[PDB]
Each structure stands twice: as C-alpha cells, then as structure tokens.
Symmetry: D2
Subunit: 396 residues, 4 copies
C-alpha cells in the first residue's frame, strides 16, 4: 500500500538538519516516480541510493535562499517523465547544486557547488563519463571580476535580477543500470558583464570547439542564421551539453519567447532551411498542431525552444516546451491522453490520468493547475514522437 | 547468474582505500548470505545499505593490524546462519570495530571504536534500542592506567598475549525490517590487571545490576556454583548482552574448555541443579549426543559453552559450540544434513550442501575444511532445536 | 588595535552555516578572554585551535533550540575567569554539546552529543585523560524508557520543564600547554523518572564507586548528613567530576537555594562538623562576609553552593556562587576591586574594571547588569582565596 | 630550544593514518622553514594552519604510490626559499595533490585531486583569487580516452614512463597575511596522445587566450622562434600560471636540457632578440657567470629554464635552475655565500650556512649532497637579483 523504494532511508541518518528536512520534502515523491517509471525493483534502489547521497547533500539549506533557474518556481529540482512510442516511460532529473555559500560574497552566482558535484560524479565510476566537452563551455562562460560589475548590477530601478545561475545539471535514469549525466550553461551573466550580445559569444563557444573538431559548424551555423533573422535569441537563451565522449555528443541550444502565434511556432520549427531538406520537420509539425489545439491555453503563452545538434547529421532536431502551469492538470491530463490515441499508443493513454492521481494522491486533480508545468515535443524518423512532461517537484 | 544484493555499490564511492579494499574482500560474500537467508529483496537492500555505511568503515585499515577475539583467525568479522525448526534461516553478524589507532599508544585495547560505532547505532532510529544495560557492563570492565600494567605485560618469556579485545558487537537480521543489536564484554584484561580471578568480578558485575533489578540472581548464582565446583571458568570466559530494554533482556555467559570427553559435555550441560528441575536439559542433551557421534572429530576437541539467563525464568538455556575447522566441510555438510532428517526438518536437510557450494563457488567442497568453523546447539521447549553455523567470513 | 588570537580563522572555511554563524557570535569574544587571561601567544593559538575544531562544531544549530542548564540565559556555553592570590588569572569554559537531534524524538535529552564530544576528546592525546570515573556516573544516571515517562511529563498544567540536560562539560585552560577536562551530571531527570528522592541515588552513585575505592565516604557522608538535616538538596542539586585518574580525582556536589539570609549562608558553610575540626572554614567565612556586604543585592538573592571532596583529605572545601545579573556590573567591578585591596592583591584590583571595559568595548559598563552573572568563593589553607567570575558569553 | 610553529598539532587529531603519518614526515620540517623565513609569529601559525588542513590531506596515502613530476625524487612536495636583495627571505611551496585513486583505473593521471584542492582554495576567501586563466589551460590540455592510448603506452620495451602528472600547484607565502597561488600544467601527456609536437599545442594554448586578450603574443612568439631554431623544447617542457586576474597575470614557460656548455647557457639566456633591446639580460647574464664558476659541477650538468611573460611588458624575464644534488651542500653553502658578498648582501651571506645546519640539525652538512637540489637565477631592473634554493623536503 505505500510507495516502496523509500525504505533505504530506514537505516540512514542524514548528517545535517538541512538534508533530513529536504528528504522529508522530496524523498517520498521521488520514490513514487520510480514506481511510475516502471523501473526494475533492483534498479529503483540503485537510483534511490544515488539520490540520497549526491542530490540530497547538494540541495543545501532547506529554507532555501537560492532562486534556481532551471525551475519555474525557483527550487533547485524538477522531475520529468519521458514518454516514448509504445515503450516504458523514463525519468529525468534536472537540478542545480547549492550550498549555504550560494549567493554570498564568496560565491554570488553558484559556481562552487557545480564543480563540487562534478568531482563526485567523476569519482563515481560511471560508464563512458567524460568531462572534456562541458569543461570547455565553462571555461568560455566563466567570469573574473565581471563579478564586480555583476555585484554592481543589483539595482532596483534598472531591473537586473532575471537569473543568477551560471550552470546546472541533468540526470537521466534509463531502464538499464546507468545514468547519463547532462549539463547546462547559462550565458546571460557572462554576456551581461561583457556588454556583448548574448548569442555572439555562443557562436565562439562553438567555434572554439570547432577548431578542436568541426562537425557542429553546419548544423549550428544554420541555427544562428534563423535567430539573426528572427527577433533574436535573447536574455533567456542558454545552452546544454552531454557528459559523454565528443563523437557521441548531442549538444543543444535553448531559448525563450513570449511571442505566441501558431504562425510564429511554424516560423521557428520550419524557419527556412530545414523545411525543404527533410520531411521529419514537416511530419512532426503536423502532429504538433493538434496538441496546440487540444491544449486550449484559455486566451482564445510564452514558450521555450530547443535545437539538438548531432555530429552524425547536419539536421538539428527541434524541440519545444509548452505552458501547462495555468492550465487545468485534468484538462491537460484528459487532452494529453487523447493525443496518445491519435498516435495509437497502447497503454500510456489509458493509465496516464490514473498514473497522475497516483503520483499526487494528497492533491485533487479536479482543482490543480501547477502539478504540471511544461510539455516538450520532438520528432525523429527513427524515434518517432518524443514527448516529456515536467512536474511540480516539491511536496509543499 | 550473479549475486544480487551488491548492486547498490554501483553508484557508491568508498571514500578511503581502506573501505574499497574491505568491500572487495567481503562485499561479494555478504550479498551471497542474504540470498542464502531467503530474505525479501527489499530487505536485502536495507541490510546491504547498513552493511556498506556502518560496518565497512568500522573495519579500519585493510591490511589489518588488530587481531580480534571474536574470530578463530582474528579478522574482525564472522557471518553465521541460524537454522530453526521448519522455518526460514537467519543471518548472524558478529564483528568488532577497529581503527588505525587500535593497538597503538592512544588505544592499545580497542575501546575508542566500540563507543564510535555505538553512537552511530543510536543515531539510526532502531526499534527498542536501549544502551543503559550494556553501558553498565562497560563501566564495570573499564580500565584506567591498568593499561600501564597491561602495556607492561607484553613479555615474550611469560606469555601474556592471548586476547587483547575489550568489547565487540553482534548484528541479527530477522526477516522483518529490523536489527537486534547484541553486545559483548571481555573480562580477561580487566581481571589480568586487578590480579583478581576472572569470574569473581563477573559476579560483582551482575550484583551491581542486581541492586538495580534483581531477577538474574537465582539463575546466575546457579551458574557460579557449578563453575566454582568445576575446573572453573578461565581466561577465555566472557560475557554477552542485548541492546534491548532490561525487562526483555537476555544476557549470556560464554567460556571455553579444552577438556573433551562426552562425560564432561554431559557434566556441563546437566551440572547438578538444572538436571532434575526441567526436562529440556535432558531432552536437548539427548539430541546433542547424536550430532556428537555424527561429527567424528577424527581422534577416535576444544569447545565453547554458553548459558542464557532470562529474567522471566530461573532456568538458563545452555548452548555449546563445536569445532568444525579441521573437519571436512563436506563430511560435516553431509552429517549435519542427516541430523535434520532425524529431527524431521523438511527442506534444510536436502538443500544445505547445495546452499554451501553456492556460498563458496570459487572453492571446492571436496577438500575444504576451514569454510565451516563452529556449530552451536540449543534446545528450548517452545523453540525446539536452535542451531547455528559459523563460516569462513573473508574471501581470500 | 584588534583582538589578536582570532587570526587563525582567516584560512579556515567553516563547513556548515551553523558553525561560521556561531563563530560570528563568539569567536571575537573568546579571543579577548585569552588576551585577558594573559596566556602565552603560542598558548592562545593552541587553545583557539581547540576551540574552533571541537567547540564550535559541538554548539549545533545556531538559532538554537536547546536550552542548556549550565548557563543563566540557556545558551550552551559560558566563559569564566579564575582569580587567584598574586598570580596570573585563568580562563574557564563550561559548555554543553548540541546537535539538531537535541530535543527530537531520537534524543530528547541531549545524551548523544555528550558521548560524541567525549569520543573526540579521547582521540586528542591529552595528558592524564582517564574517563572511567565519569563513565561510572553516566551509567548510574542513564535512563531507558524512563524517557517515555519523561516524554509524558511535558504538562503545561503541572510544571515539569525546569531543566532538560543530562550532562555537560567544562574546560580549564591552565597557563601551560594543557587542558584539564571537567564533567557534569544532572540527576533531576533520572530521579524524576524513578519517583525517588534526588539525593538518595546520589548516595548510591558515590557508594557504587565506594566498593571500587572507598575514600569519598567520610567527606561525602558528612555532606549527606547536613543536607538531610537542612531543607535538603532539591531538584536543582547536581554533580561534577574530573576526567583525571581516580587517585587525583576531585569530585564536587553542587546545589541551589533561594533562601538568602546571612544566617543560612553561615548554616551551610559551617553546618556542624566542619566548623570545629578545621580553621579554614572559620577563616574563609569571615572574608566571605565582607563581599556579601560589599555587594548590596539592593533588597536591603538565590545562590548556588558546592562542596569539593578530595580523597587526600576528609574535609570538603565549600564554594558558593553569588548573583550579579541584576547588579550593576560597574558597582560589581568597583566593589570587587575593593575586596582585592582588602586581601592585598597587587594588580588584579587596579586593572579589573579596565579589563572589564576591554572585554566588552561595544557595551557600556555604566548601564550594564547581565555582563557579570555569578561570582564564586573558595578558601584553602594552601591556595588562599579562590574566586571566579562568570560572564555573558555571547556577543548579541 | 625546539622549532616553534608546530605546537598547533597538540590539540589536533589527524583523522586518517595517512595524514598523521605524513605530519610525522614533514610537519617538523615545514615549521623550521617558517622560522627560517623570519615570518611574524602570528603569521607562521596562520600558514601552519593552512598547511595542516589543506596540503597534508592532499598528500594522500603515506607509503606513496604516485611519482610526482615537480620533485626530483618523486615525492609530491618541495620547499623553496626566495632570496632577495637586502630583504627578508620568502618561502615557496610547490606540491601536487594525490589520493589513493591517483594512478588507478579511475584516474590514471591525477586529474581528480587537482580539482578537489582547487575547489577548497576557492572556498577559502583569498584576496584576488581568480581561476578563469588557469581553467583555460586545463581545458586545452585535458584528455578524454586519450587515456586509452595512454593506458596503451605502458611498454617496458619502448620507454614511455617519463612523467605521468598532468598539473600541479605552487604556494607562495609572502610576509603579509596572504598566499599567492601558482598553478602548473604538464603538456607531455596530451601531446603524446595526439602525436603532435609538444610545442605546437602550447602555442594554440596561448593563441586561444590571445583572442580573449592579446598581450602575450609579442613576448611569447619571441620565445617560440628561439625554441624552433634551437634543439627545441622537448618532452620535459611545461607551463606555469598565476591564480590572479589576467591583467596582473605573469605566465611562464619552463623546460629542461641536458646540454651543459656555458656557451649554450649564453645561447638560451640571450638568444637573439632580447640581447640588443634591453640591458638586464646582459647585466643579469654577467652575474650568472660567476655562480656558474663558483659552483664547479666537478666534471671539469643538465639545467632547467624558465621565461616569464608579463602583459605589461614585451620582454620576458629569464630564469634558470642549476643542479646542486650531486654537489656538496657545504661546498654549495660556502660558494653560495661568497656570491652574496659579491652582490653586497648584508646578512644573507653570513647567516646562510648557519641557517642551513639549523634546518637539518639531524643531518651533517659535512657529508650531505641531497639537502640542496636546485638554484634559480633571475635578474630584473627593478628587482635586482632574484634567486631561490630548492631543498630536500622530507624527513627520512
């Protein structure tokens, strides 16, 4: 009758008041996603063990002080379920390490906990875990006594407090006994200090690795061209990375817009170049139109975007993120369940709203809006339809 | 195909070379005993979780330096299986915490690691865990600058190095999610210093708790009377205790003899008093005679003894230990298997020798003698026949 | 111009917010007392180093939750200066270990931080550090599921919350490179649970060690006899101990009264037996009369008492504690300085009120009362006049 | 009569056998150098505190396994004294972090301990401590599964084990309360893997920061051109860096040769360009000639070199290191003392050999050769003569 995987904590003493108190906040919920993800029972205890030892210490002060970037609310963790064509669902963790020094004189922009977690991650003997590529992006996006101007930017009159993080993490739990670790970099602060357009140094970040190896040039240079033509990738734009070897690496470019017209959604997904040359973009966009209409956003909608550059191709796979905070979680659960019948997905369609009340039995799906925050869409020829749902990740 | 419960370590980094090396030495073997005990899979991960975090650090330096008392060889851990009439077998761990200070100028007699582990065990919220009774026995057997005379005893000419330990622990894994913790006290050192017979201050130790609560007097005074009449309980004698509340507490007195005649085993089991007054003593001794003859010690045999004092009675339950190191592990596996048919034990009889090659697949039961070290015998009216086997507890 | 000894912290990162945050509260003040006590500069850094590594971590959560017993206000540390005839002043620290578990379900009465601090102390190779005697007092005053009745006592209607501590520590920093460690025991909780008079089990605690060694019986039995005749040593009565070897051990019995008449101060100091048999009692009481009159308590006064039993004698040396919180610290500075001229003390008299403004430069001696809380008096033939002043031990 | 600064350790318990055991090896010697450097007594304790907490734990296993690069013998630490014209001598520490994982499958080339120590150095709030520049040089010289080919290089037939380190640290203790941190990079391994000349990728390392800021181009290209014309900078060449901000940064290029003729020493110091344009090179070389002849290397002498690039100039300051291991430390103490009279140094000349027996009172300057290993020479217009002596840095 209770959630199963959380019985490891029975014989564990959390050394600090900070950790025991966070466990009390998220340990229950994480055990429920492992049950939802249908992971092997021995698998769930492995990922629990990792969660207790590396992420609980990394949350830092329980009454938190850091406003994280990766989460809508600000708390430094969010959980996600990756829904895949006719196959077991997966679990995504993206979170930012924090300590009591975060936001202080010593580390006003959370650089220290990032490398603290990254050192433990390397100590963990992880299959095919290589840091050279992510380390390159930090070296480009570090800041020296740019901090002084950043300390100076804190003006109430001139709003200069959108985001303060400088990097973050992501953890994917595949059904095998493996974590793929995914890392993030946030250029707003480095460009804010240099008085240089946010995207201009994103290109150099890619070009500096281009002289190292030059397989991202074509795919990326095509992204810049649209973003220069467009309103432009702005303060909210940022970057992603995988901690795997470079040849297998899949780097991404994120960004945000408040412009919500279907025409603009078509303008970004298609742009110019990628429309003609491949059918997936066209095929995927069609299926993207029906979820846009299934999820009536109630105004008749600011969105995040993503282009996934892979070296083994010259066609970046687009991915968009969709507002569900503000939309009824049942309306979305119902409407999101229909879209699986439209694609012909056998079980996920029927058991999702019953796997949604199961994840939050305390709360009432009738009245909740914030239990579901964002939805991602991606389309590949081989993979079919990618789609992941980001949830409310704290119990309170 | 591999042993299951050890997959927690996949995402764990053992902080010190000392621990990783101990893991490499016993981590495989402990996970095989959990499979042997037929514990629930979530149970096995709980007991592994405990094993990794409290016992691996507690072993100290891998190329060890402390010779422990609790083990035939000296290594500070031994695993044991509790076989019970027609029911699931249980797993016993008895081990002594050690550090690099053990045996040094700072702690020449392993007192500091005992209190170190005992603080952590209390931190872990354990059901019905009360230390006052064990704390009493430590306080009685402590030594202040008796250490100086003890430092002085180290003479090659006058042999004065039989045992150096001062206390130890025991961990019982019942099929529920619970550990019963069992503690030990070693009087040889305190008695060696005081130049006082080893047993006389065992008696004051019981009498000091007798004024606190006086339910052990009858049973215990009956033991002393036999031991005073007898050759006496000697240097090897020592004391046992449970970390539960006093009312439910079951304290034990162990000891050793090299006198091996069946008559002397009968003298010890019966003595005088406990023969007439209760039948279990007579019943249990009868079943004990056939295993004595099944296990031909090949000389036609030094043995350990135990008397279990329970307050809710005035009849201590005897328990003997039998040498199997030196006896063929196959011959013992076979002969121990016949004795279960004589008692009519349904499955334990047939699957024991196949659960013995399973525990040591690397080794050959054909030729091994040291895989099985001791066997304990106990008989109660309610429980029937208690019997446990103590095994070779290191991989090398 | 600044306090000197606090420059070790420059290259130290306090691991927790709790510690750095406690440092900010007490580190400045502790450096000022080392300057006051006129310790060697190499001496001051040794004691600073100890204070940082063992005492700051042991305070636990900074917004404290534990009300300690040893301090007037409740915070778990107090500093004290030992003034001695024509010689360098000394510095006393008495404090109680705390964690976030203190007062929780797991440890509702601070027993765990006591043994945590005690294990580290034994790790520090301290000259002539033997714990067996204090361990004896803890075993006697431990409580097993008396905790349940203690959990049950928390009634607002029947007041049952005077004191919750179970033991505490005290540290004396002599002018040599040595700490003498002093321990405390608090019988209120053990006696409250057993429904047994507080002093009756104090007698057994002394008698249980009397069979071990019987040199405190005479001096102590003389203490019981007066306290039985008197109003009696009450809930507030409690016990003290030194961590040195038993032969050099100097145990004490403290207690409290609200009865403030000079006759009653005389009744306790003299009692019956110790008046006639030694003149020091007579000599010391006289000098004690003038400080009582120098220190007009403004009502024309609850006081603490102490009897120090030494095995090398049969005459316990008394010591009383006097309220100064509520009395103007300047009035106390002036009048305490006059009493040194009455004894003829060369420098302590002249430089005390200037060593008082130096210790609290932020505050105004003109208006402060709580900066000086208690003053102790003792008289020995050999030592002359003992007297120590307890101070306000936090910056805020 | 004893060395003073090591009295902090009295109240410190080194948690691991590895640390206590290293302290016993180097703690005495480090305390004697602080007395030699004539630092303030409160200063020496600050620096001792830092050495105890940050460099002792970083040494890892005491019976070491890692052969470091920065040290002649191989042990991962060396101490050095900076002798300067008519002013207090300074203390240099260069040491490489190590753990039991160093040289393992997990980290076969010591990258993990480098980043561990670098995080702590950032946690300690140090004046003007900026890592972006050092981080840049690591990202360029990292290796991902170049390790596989490096794992493959370990052939006894083709010698491929000159150096295995990838980076190291340096600590400068100035007479104020401040440490300047200096970092090192070892290109041999990265170029060995890429099958690319060791120097060609040093140039890209400088050019990649040149697009970031372009003030090292002129000076550095002047070094490359000489090194290309010359026999060339080889396997032993490596790179140096300061942890200060870029504008004040002083980067260095080191290297080694076995070619020992005075003429070749003249070729390297002068080369072509820097001869004409500035006289310091000419003046400094003159003074260098007499120490070459004072120190008759006994063969009638492989040397290390250094070129210091400062952005605020276009003239790199040379520095050479001279073999003293193999030369009598007294012959060196005497001959090094004459050279101070030649420059007119008031006290350093007279008190040096008496400050040398003081550092090694155990050993006999009469017969020792290995107590003094290398001597560095530098000449500046503003600074005059730089010279530092590298010593035998372990007790055994």
């Amino acid at each position: 009758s209770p959630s199963p995987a959380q019985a490891l904590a029975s014989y564990h003493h959390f050394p600090t008041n900070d950790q025991e108190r966070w466990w009390e906040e998220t340990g229950s919920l994480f055990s429920r996603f492992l049950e939802a993800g249908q992971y092997g029972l021995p698998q769930q205890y492995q990922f629990m063990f990792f969660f207790m030892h590396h992420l609980i210490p990394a949350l830092g002060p329980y009454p938190q002080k850091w406003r994280s970037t990766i989460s809508r609310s600000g708390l430094p963790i969010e959980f996600s379920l990756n829904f895949q064509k006719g196959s077991h669902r997966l679990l995504r963790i993206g979170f930012e390490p924090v300590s009591f020094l975060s936001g202080s004189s010593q580390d006003p922009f959370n650089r220290i906990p990032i490398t603290d977690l990254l050192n433990r991650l390397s100590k963990l003997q992880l299959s095919n875990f290589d840091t050279p590529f992510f380390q390159h992006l930090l070296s480009k996006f570090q800041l020296s006594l740019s901090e002084v101007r950043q300390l100076q930017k804190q003006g109430s009159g001139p709003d200069a407090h959108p985001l303060k993080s400088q990097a973050a993490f992501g953890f994917d739990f595949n059904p095998d006994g493996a974590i793929l670790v995914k890392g993030y970099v946030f250029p707003y602060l480095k460009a804010k200090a240099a008085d240089v357009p946010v995207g201009t140094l994103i290109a150099e970040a890619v070009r500096t690795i281009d002289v190292e190896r030059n397989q991202f040039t074509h795919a990326f240079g095509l992204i810049n061209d649209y973003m220069q033509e467009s309103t432009g990738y702005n303060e909210y734009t940022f970057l992603s990375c995988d901690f795997v070897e470079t040849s297998e690496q899949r780097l991404k470019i994120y960004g945000a817009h408040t412009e919500v017209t279907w025409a603009k959604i078509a303008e970004m997904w298609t742009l110019g170049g990628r429309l003609i040359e491949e059918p997936e973009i066209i095929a995927g966009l069609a299926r993207l139109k029906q979820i846009w209409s299934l999820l009536q956003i109630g105004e008749g909608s600011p969105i995040i975007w993503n282009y996934e550059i892979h070296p083994g191709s010259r066609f970046p796979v687009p991915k968009f993120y969709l507002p569900v905070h503000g939309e009824n979680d049942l309306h979305v659960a119902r409407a999101l369940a229909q879209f699986w019948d439209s694609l012909g997905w056998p079980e996920h369609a029927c058991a999702y709203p019953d796997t949604l009340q199961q994840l939050y039995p305390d709360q009432d799906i009738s009245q909740t809006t914030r239990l579901q925050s964002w939805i991602s869409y991606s389309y590949t020829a081989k993979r079919g339809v990618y789609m992941s749902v980001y949830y409310h990740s704290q119990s309170t």
